[PDB]
Amino acid sequence: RVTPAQFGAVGDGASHPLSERYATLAEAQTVYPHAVALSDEIDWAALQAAVDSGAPVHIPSGDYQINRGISSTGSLQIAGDGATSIIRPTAAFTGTSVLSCVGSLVALPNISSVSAGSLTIDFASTPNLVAGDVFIIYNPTDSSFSGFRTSYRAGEFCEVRAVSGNTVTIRSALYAAYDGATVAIYKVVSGVVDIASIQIVGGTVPMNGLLVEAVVSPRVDDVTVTLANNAGVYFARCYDAKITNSNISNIGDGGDDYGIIFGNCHDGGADNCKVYARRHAIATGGDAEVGCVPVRNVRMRNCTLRNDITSGTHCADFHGNAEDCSYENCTIYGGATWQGKDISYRHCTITNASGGWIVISAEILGGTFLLDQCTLYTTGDPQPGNRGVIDVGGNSAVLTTNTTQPCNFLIQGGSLRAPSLSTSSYLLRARLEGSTVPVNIQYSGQAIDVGSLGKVLQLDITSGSTSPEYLIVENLAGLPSGITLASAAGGFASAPMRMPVLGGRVQVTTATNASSVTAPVTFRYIYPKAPTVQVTKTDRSYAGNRVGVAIANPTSASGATLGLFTDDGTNFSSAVTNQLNWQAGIYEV
Amino acid sequence: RVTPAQFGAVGDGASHPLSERYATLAEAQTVYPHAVALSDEIDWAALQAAVDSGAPVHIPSGDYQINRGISSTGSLQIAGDGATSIIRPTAAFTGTSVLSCVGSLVALPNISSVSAGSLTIDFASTPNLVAGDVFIIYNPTDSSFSGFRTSYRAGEFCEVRAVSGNTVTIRSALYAAYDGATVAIYKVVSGVVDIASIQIVGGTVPMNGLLVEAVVSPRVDDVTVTLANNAGVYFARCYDAKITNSNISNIGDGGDDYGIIFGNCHDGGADNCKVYARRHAIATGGDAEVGCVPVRNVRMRNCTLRNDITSGTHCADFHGNAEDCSYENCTIYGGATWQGKDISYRHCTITNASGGWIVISAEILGGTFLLDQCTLYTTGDPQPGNRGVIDVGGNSAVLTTNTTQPCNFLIQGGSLRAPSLSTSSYLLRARLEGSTVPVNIQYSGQAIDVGSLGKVLQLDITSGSTSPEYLIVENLAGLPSGITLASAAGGFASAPMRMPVLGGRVQVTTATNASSVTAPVTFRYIYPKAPTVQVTKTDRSYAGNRVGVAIANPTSASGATLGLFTDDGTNFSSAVTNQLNWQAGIYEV
Amino acid sequence: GRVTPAQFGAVGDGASHPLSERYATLAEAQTVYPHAVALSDEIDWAALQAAVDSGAPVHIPSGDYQINRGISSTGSLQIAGDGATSIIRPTAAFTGTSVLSCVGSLVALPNISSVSAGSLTIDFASTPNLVAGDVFIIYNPTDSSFSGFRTSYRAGEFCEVRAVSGNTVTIRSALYAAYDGATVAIYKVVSGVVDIASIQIVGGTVPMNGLLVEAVVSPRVDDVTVTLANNAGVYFARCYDAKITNSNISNIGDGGDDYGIIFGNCHDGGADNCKVYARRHAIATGGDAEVGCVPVRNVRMRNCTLRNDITSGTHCADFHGNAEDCSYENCTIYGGATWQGKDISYRHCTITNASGGWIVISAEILGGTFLLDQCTLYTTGDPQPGNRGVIDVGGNSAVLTTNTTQPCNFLIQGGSLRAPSLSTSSYLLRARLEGSTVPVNIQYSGQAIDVGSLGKVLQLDITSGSTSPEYLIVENLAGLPSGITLASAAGGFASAPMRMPVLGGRVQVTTATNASSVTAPVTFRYIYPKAPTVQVTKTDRSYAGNRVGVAIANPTSASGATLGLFTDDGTNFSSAVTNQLNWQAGIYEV
Ligand SMILES: [Ca+2]
Ligand SMILES: [Ca+2]
Ligand SMILES: [Ca+2]
Ligand SMILES: [Ca+2]
Ligand code: NA
Ligand code: NA
Ligand code: NA
Ligand code: NA
Ligand code: NA
Ligand code: NA
Ligand code: NA
Ligand code: NA
Ligand code: NA
Ligand code: NA
Ligand code: NA
Ligand code: NA
Ligand code: NA
Ligand code: NA
């Protein structure tokens, strides 16, 4: 509705300080009240004034030179003509973000204590809320959500359903319980944020290309952002923030170096974005400011993500304050991570990080962690660095005294290709370093393509202990002969186990000078302990004078000696074939 | 192209009746031929005149007060500057919908009878159709698609491939057969419908925020709609209706209370929308008007949905006239439903409705119903309401004489967390109330996280009968000891079954004063009938004078007495240990 | 956009207006439109072309613009309209290859040292004109350097620059393949902004393409409607991260290749939320034989509904054999789909049959992994009379040949497959060797099947060549009727490590006091590829008078077994009493 040209923008790609047009600061401020100095860029002055007008701003193709950030409280509405509508910080730029909009957390009355899964909140006095309003429940106590980091504090975003007196009902169930004496409540007050069809060429100075903070349903669509600093796009304390159809590339400056990060956000996500950043193309986390609650129901879909493989870290990120978030239908070059609680990767294609691993874990609070029908590729071998291809604390402190809820690690279907492992390598490692909770494993349905391999599961205990409900390896295709199904220490060894069935038909021939004949079997896979073995004689009835009793003696985790013995010890009177049909498995759960 | 300001709009948020500007109605009608009274809103008159010009309408930021719907026939093109372009019914509003566009159903010739799966339609005379045209085959006979409601009539939308004389080929196979003597055919005649980047604040009076009816490929994008009445967005009899990137919030007025509903629609769906509504955030169904055919190939993807949990109903809806529709990659707070035919939930996260159940059924015609790799949560327990966590007629008439096709209920992978069930609760219930078709269950691969639990399956018959092709429980993680695998009545009990394997190794020591030694085993899970049991002796050969024959006697659904007996009844001559390796399962299909 | 066709003199009223209506001479017309060719050219075309030529973004108001020549550009093309009422319409007099087109450039870079697959470092022979974010193509001009199935399936790929230090260029993702430095030419992709949105092209019968975008980084097509009766509604050629979204594309075809949207030699990007029809392939991938014709990689089709002409006899959803690491996800596909190339997946798709009755067909299999991941499949027909599986891998065509050079894994995981009209001779999946010598592995796992009659799950044949598979697995299937064959397996398939489902039951036998044995026959519900591993145990009786009896099976075969209870020493049983013979059978080799 307004343009920067209407407020005097030039936008020709060259510098135009206000001094080119105004002899005095007072004269410049008569036109641009918030100009700071005559050396400020006319393009910046014009863009900021247009934003300040309160009308949606349309930015025609041009190359706008700015020395300060374009910022707003409340609302920010900017739409360009596409990638040719360029906002470009100059070498003289100062400020935290190229574009920014910041809403408000406004104190609400305190509340009564409330249980997890409730949809009713009792305020101490009349709350200024109506249906559709958004508020944050916030616990200022350090580590109130997770002990892994100080800043992982508890709370969540609620959406008002109805209000009756001091009672406020909400539109979806609470993720967590709150003691009323420990939380402060804030109404999220913000205007309309919609940023579309522009290109930010941020350079090396600003920390963020775009910052949107404490806003309900901001929208970023069809943008291009390049930067060499901390974050291409940073959503902080936003509810239903969406960024869609955008290309974000952050070369980094050697800091946290994020492409798109959702800090203390709830709902929304990224859809159909192509993203590169040095460390984490997409990430979740937050800060330590008021309202720094966990990241929940944030969904990354249909993106392609790349990072700098030499950074050594995972490309797709969640930090340990995430709960109930996922990457879905994403192509992820350079690895992914399980952190926090209740995290899923669904139908993603994921390649390895530099260490050779594909999925790595950290800061596991507990809950369920899932690789759902993913396609996994590694060109390396993480075993020399003590990690699994899917790693849970192999060489790091991940399952600790800060892991306070039972954990379920679920690998369902999909495929895993890893041509360059050794006979020492393992597909999944979990190592306890202080936790005392059940750690359950379901490794199920996946098709595996390897050269050499040592083991499917490697389950270790450095400190702490576990009593799992289950330890399951099942329906795997592509396992080569000789591998170990699960090395399991301590409480993993005594866990209720299900292990794959092996078996076959072994011919034995009786001898007329003996009451028995035996034959050795070496299992194609090594079990964690002696499996449950069946043996049955087929394809012969009387071997002369006796049927014979089929047994196995001994049996072990690695094999068994099959035998056919006359019950009473009489020698067989004929020398003839018999088929010993054997099988082995473990079926405790 | 045109703006309401050009036609005299004010849009400042206050009321401006025509009387402010025109002394008589005649005077006003010179400018606005459609004006009804001098009390009409200038903003309404202006917006309607803008629509009536036939040019695309751009609505600049503004708050436009209207007392009547903005409506059109055939085409409607409205685009604003985003959420600050607000259309607002006043207290005096009269009309059914805030914005609406209605296309036409134009008679085509009758047709010859045609079979399901055909791509060739024979018209009785020359049809006015060319490639790309869309028509509806419509059976006006009540319940011609489904007997569950009279308005579930048969027919479908067809897209013309080629026309040769009176023969019309179509671009995809027919879903159903039609007797030519029973159907009337209608060409869908409509123009361009495109509604984008506006906000409708509908209030309590209009039944619909947006209504689009009988239109080919209408588009709704980047809109925000709030309402407290029947439907935020209602697509009726549309082909390839698509709504994208929109936020829809219907507080409801205590009726059907839908967010987005697709009535009698084919193709299209909802993508990347955040939706709240009191009863069903998204739904499908229809009315009883001409062309009220089944809802097909409508796909809801990448949405977050919420409802009022106190409504007691499911948040994500399909009615019984749905065929071949799905929700995929959606976050669903407040439950989902199987109804109609061939319905799936894929990679969704779903929480419980107030009853404690998560997926509920109604109006099952038959076909295949799938929960594919979904993450399911319930904080409650549906068993006291006689419902499973996944429920098929537990407490309602769902599998009845109106269920006319074989049913397959499939649960594949994913997870289910339900910490608060009792030892009486069951994960899935199916109860017959009059149906006679096969009802097949595949409960396969899911990771389960419970405290107490009674049963995996509960399969009951109040009336009717069934001869299932299969009844399968397999590859489940997380089942606690003592649960029942399936309680199965009548034809469920005699169905070909597959039930999980349990087994173990039990040490027994022979005694020199007996020919046998036994040991009791109680299975971890209770089978629906005595399972198929194997026992083999290992890790010992002769026990003095005899090997011993390993048997089980008795066996039952809940356990077995393992035994080692000398074949000839001679007492064992030595007291030595032996391992009885036992296992059980059911392997009929 | 900045400029409009009106500003350059357009009419856009739907009727023809040759330049001769306004200008008496060609010279006078060219004063206004320098690139007009003749006074008979359309004013709408001259105006639209001039608007594009201005270099400003072009906004096209509602109107119906008549053009007799393509609207084209080099480097950049920015066009946005008011939606489907902004119509660009070739006239009967149209001449040109494409209605709308933008072509970027491939600019030679220095040569590189040999590099391994999986590398992220490239060494240039001399200083390269590259910075971070730049895109280049490694190209091998040698015919069939990626796949032997076609000449034009040449090797190479798109790389995105991470950093440059001296002659060393690091890249943002690992190379898919290895390259001999002496065999490749390297090219920078130089292009500007391409953005086409919110217009309708009514192409007609003349143009080969509705929209062509060639050699461009991140072109964007959004909210467009395209109809045509020729070769390709939308053709992306040698593009990196081409995205078409929210569009309706319909190609009636002219009897040629007849594509809706085709990605030729493209890397990254894909199609999202599109409704597409084309006579042959609604969406396809492939390419041409021009410089830079590299494999199609990381192209993702998502959230689309696709239809084709079923009487064409071909699959609706296409990849050609030069595809690697591509997929369809969350698509409704009427008229079948295909596995070709390497590492291809369909995920959460609903797919119906092509005319032959099959649903997924293969061709030009290089090797790697081919996945149907939780798909819903439906056929109204039966492909067996045409010698093809419902899921087919060379049943009646040359698919697994000397050009299949890498181990193949065919995976069917979960989902459902309904096929009510098969016969007792039909098979769900067929794979047939016609010259390949690599392992061919099958995982058929977890699917719920709904059939009337059926012959077999797998039909594994060898016409020529040979195979030593790592695995052959059938497991966790629901809905198989009695009497089917699990796997017909010939040659090396027959000797592969197999996993086959368990069958079992409890059979009552009563001893006789005048014999030392009692037997009972069992016929398995499914026929195994070879004699299965069988267990038998006696339950629910201890001594039958004087003896327990030893439970065995004799004989056993692929189709059944004779269960037996025999006193060990051949003494007659002394009592006639019941016993339960608990039997089971399966194959458990992998
Ligand atoms: Ca390594
Ligand atoms: Ca309940
Ligand atoms: Ca035995
Ligand atoms: Ca056929
Ligand atoms: Na000042
Ligand atoms: Na100054
Ligand atoms: Na503002
Ligand atoms: Na609301
Ligand atoms: Na911290
Ligand atoms: Na012999
Ligand atoms: Na009147
Ligand atoms: Na068409
Ligand atoms: Na002993
Ligand atoms: Na001329
Ligand atoms: Na860059
Ligand atoms: Na060729
Ligand atoms: Na072929
Ligand atoms: Na008896």
Author numbering:
A (entry chain A), B (entry chain C): 181 to 769
C (entry chain B): 180 to 769
Give the published text.
Phage LKA1 encodes a trimeric tailspike protein (LKAgp49) with a typical conserved N-terminal structure-associated domain and an unconserved central and C-terminal region with predicted polysaccharide binding/degrading activity (Pfam 12708 and right-handed β-helices). For crystallization, the N-terminal particle-binding domain of LKAgp49 (residues 1–167) was removed. The resulting mutant – gp49d – constitutes a ‘catalytic module’ of the tailspike. Eventually, one crystal of gp49d gave a clean and isotropic diffraction pattern that extended to 1.9 Å resolution. Gp49d and gp61d display 32% amino acid sequence identity and can be superimposed with a root mean squared deviation of 1.6 Å between 572 (or 97%) equivalent C-alpha atoms. Gp49d can be divided into three domains: (1) a β-helix typical to many tailspikes (residues 181–283 and 371–675); (2) a β-barrel or an insertion domain that is positioned on a side of the β-helix and that interrupts the run of polypeptide chain comprising the β-helix (residues 284–370); and (3) a β-sandwich or jellyroll C-terminal domain (residues 676–769). The most conserved residues form an intricate system connected by hydrogen and ionic bonds with Asp497 coordinating His494 and His499. The three residues are likely to be the most important in the catalysis with Asp497 being the critical residue. A highly conserved Arg329 extends towards the active site where it forms a hydrogen bond with His499. Based on these data, it was concluded that the tailspike protein LKA1gp49 is a specific polysaccharide lyase.
Bacteriophage-encoded depolymerases are highly specific enzymes, acting at the first step of phage infection and serve for specific recognition of host cell receptor, as well as for the degradation of polysaccharides. The polysaccharide-degrading enzymes are primarily virion-associated proteins like tail fibers, tailspikes, base plate or neck, whereas some are soluble proteins, released during bacterial lysis. These enzymes target structural polysaccharides (LPS, capsular polysaccharides, peptidoglycan) and essential components of the biofilm matrix.
